[PDB]
Design a protein around this ligand. Structure first.
Ligand SMILES: Nc1cc(-n2ccnc2)c2cccc(O)c2n1
Length: 124
Protein backbone atom coordinates (compact mmCIF):
# COMPACT_ATOMS: atom_id res chain seq x y z
CA UNK A 1 0.00 0.00 0.00
CA UNK A 2 1.59 3.26 -0.94
CA UNK A 3 1.83 6.21 1.48
CA UNK A 4 0.72 9.71 0.44
CA UNK A 5 3.35 11.40 -1.73
CA UNK A 6 5.34 14.30 -0.26
CA UNK A 7 3.64 17.69 -0.33
CA UNK A 8 4.22 19.96 -3.31
CA UNK A 9 2.46 22.97 -1.78
CA UNK A 10 2.17 24.27 1.78
CA UNK A 11 0.55 27.65 2.58
CA UNK A 12 2.37 27.88 5.94
CA UNK A 13 5.73 27.59 4.20
CA UNK A 14 7.24 30.80 2.77
CA UNK A 15 7.80 30.84 -0.99
CA UNK A 16 10.55 32.49 -2.99
CA UNK A 17 11.87 32.73 -6.55
CA UNK A 18 15.64 33.07 -6.89
CA UNK A 19 17.79 33.00 -10.02
CA UNK A 20 19.43 29.82 -8.72
CA UNK A 21 16.05 28.16 -8.17
CA UNK A 22 14.80 29.10 -11.63
CA UNK A 23 17.98 27.52 -13.02
CA UNK A 24 17.30 24.32 -11.08
CA UNK A 25 14.06 23.93 -13.00
CA UNK A 26 14.95 25.49 -16.37
CA UNK A 27 18.35 23.81 -16.64
CA UNK A 28 19.19 21.25 -13.97
CA UNK A 29 15.96 19.28 -13.55
CA UNK A 30 14.76 19.62 -17.13
CA UNK A 31 17.97 18.14 -18.59
CA UNK A 32 18.12 15.41 -15.91
CA UNK A 33 14.48 14.65 -16.79
CA UNK A 34 15.51 13.70 -20.32
CA UNK A 35 18.38 11.35 -19.45
CA UNK A 36 17.68 7.76 -20.41
CA UNK A 37 18.04 6.61 -16.78
CA UNK A 38 15.60 9.24 -15.48
CA UNK A 39 12.31 7.32 -15.72
CA UNK A 40 12.40 5.43 -12.35
CA UNK A 41 12.83 8.78 -10.57
CA UNK A 42 10.17 10.79 -12.42
CA UNK A 43 7.45 9.88 -9.89
CA UNK A 44 7.13 8.48 -6.35
CA UNK A 45 8.16 4.84 -6.00
CA UNK A 46 5.02 2.72 -6.51
CA UNK A 47 5.94 -0.05 -4.09
CA UNK A 48 2.73 -1.96 -4.88
CA UNK A 49 3.23 -2.08 -8.66
CA UNK A 50 6.93 -2.92 -8.25
CA UNK A 51 6.37 -5.68 -5.65
CA UNK A 52 8.69 -3.84 -3.25
CA UNK A 53 6.44 -4.15 -0.19
CA UNK A 54 9.34 -3.43 2.16
CA UNK A 55 10.24 -0.15 0.42
CA UNK A 56 8.38 2.23 2.76
CA UNK A 57 9.31 0.12 5.76
CA UNK A 58 12.91 1.19 5.00
CA UNK A 59 12.57 4.60 3.31
CA UNK A 60 10.88 7.12 5.60
CA UNK A 61 11.83 10.32 3.72
CA UNK A 62 10.77 9.52 0.14
CA UNK A 63 11.66 11.97 -2.61
CA UNK A 64 11.54 11.89 -6.39
CA UNK A 65 12.07 14.20 -9.35
CA UNK A 66 8.35 14.49 -10.05
CA UNK A 67 7.85 15.89 -6.55
CA UNK A 68 10.87 18.20 -6.97
CA UNK A 69 9.61 19.38 -10.36
CA UNK A 70 6.18 20.24 -8.94
CA UNK A 71 7.83 21.98 -5.98
CA UNK A 72 9.94 24.14 -8.30
CA UNK A 73 6.95 24.93 -10.51
CA UNK A 74 5.04 25.93 -7.33
CA UNK A 75 7.85 28.19 -5.99
CA UNK A 76 7.63 25.90 -2.95
CA UNK A 77 11.30 26.40 -1.94
CA UNK A 78 12.89 29.31 -0.11
CA UNK A 79 16.34 28.83 -1.67
CA UNK A 80 18.30 26.60 -4.02
CA UNK A 81 19.91 24.67 -1.16
CA UNK A 82 16.46 23.41 -0.14
CA UNK A 83 15.96 21.90 -3.60
CA UNK A 84 19.48 20.45 -3.64
CA UNK A 85 18.73 18.71 -0.34
CA UNK A 86 15.70 17.07 -1.98
CA UNK A 87 17.87 15.82 -4.86
CA UNK A 88 20.39 14.39 -2.40
CA UNK A 89 17.57 12.71 -0.45
CA UNK A 90 16.42 11.03 -3.67
CA UNK A 91 19.92 9.72 -4.43
CA UNK A 92 20.69 8.67 -0.84
CA UNK A 93 17.38 6.78 -0.51
CA UNK A 94 18.15 4.71 -3.62
CA UNK A 95 21.59 3.77 -2.25
CA UNK A 96 20.09 2.93 1.16
CA UNK A 97 17.30 0.68 -0.15
CA UNK A 98 19.47 -1.02 -2.79
CA UNK A 99 23.01 -2.43 -3.00
CA UNK A 100 26.11 -1.29 -4.91
CA UNK A 101 26.03 -2.29 -8.56
CA UNK A 102 22.27 -2.90 -8.79
CA UNK A 103 20.75 -1.68 -12.07
CA UNK A 104 18.74 1.03 -10.28
CA UNK A 105 21.83 2.26 -8.38
CA UNK A 106 23.86 2.54 -11.60
CA UNK A 107 21.02 4.73 -12.87
CA UNK A 108 21.04 6.93 -9.75
CA UNK A 109 24.84 7.25 -9.81
CA UNK A 110 24.74 8.37 -13.45
CA UNK A 111 22.10 11.00 -12.62
CA UNK A 112 23.92 12.07 -9.46
CA UNK A 113 27.15 12.74 -11.27
CA UNK A 114 25.28 14.65 -13.98
CA UNK A 115 23.48 16.58 -11.22
CA UNK A 116 26.81 17.45 -9.57
CA UNK A 117 28.18 18.75 -12.90
CA UNK A 118 25.15 20.93 -13.54
CA UNK A 119 25.03 22.50 -10.07
CA UNK A 120 28.81 22.99 -9.96
CA UNK A 121 28.13 26.57 -11.09
CA UNK A 122 24.75 28.30 -10.56
CA UNK A 123 23.77 31.81 -11.69
CA UNK A 124 24.05 34.70 -9.23
N1 LIG B 1 14.50 -1.39 -6.15
C1 LIG B 1 14.17 -0.06 -6.64
C2 LIG B 1 13.47 0.06 -7.82
C3 LIG B 1 13.16 1.30 -8.30
N2 LIG B 1 12.43 1.36 -9.56
C4 LIG B 1 11.32 2.14 -9.85
C5 LIG B 1 10.95 1.87 -11.16
N3 LIG B 1 11.84 0.92 -11.68
C6 LIG B 1 12.75 0.61 -10.71
C7 LIG B 1 13.56 2.44 -7.60
C8 LIG B 1 13.29 3.73 -8.00
C9 LIG B 1 13.72 4.82 -7.26
C10 LIG B 1 14.41 4.62 -6.08
C11 LIG B 1 14.68 3.33 -5.65
O1 LIG B 1 15.38 3.12 -4.46
C12 LIG B 1 14.26 2.25 -6.41
N4 LIG B 1 14.54 1.02 -5.97
Amino acid sequence: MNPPPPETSNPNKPKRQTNQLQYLLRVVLKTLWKHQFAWPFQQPVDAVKLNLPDYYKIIKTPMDMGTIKKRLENNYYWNAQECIQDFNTMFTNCYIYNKPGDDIVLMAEALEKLFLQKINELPT
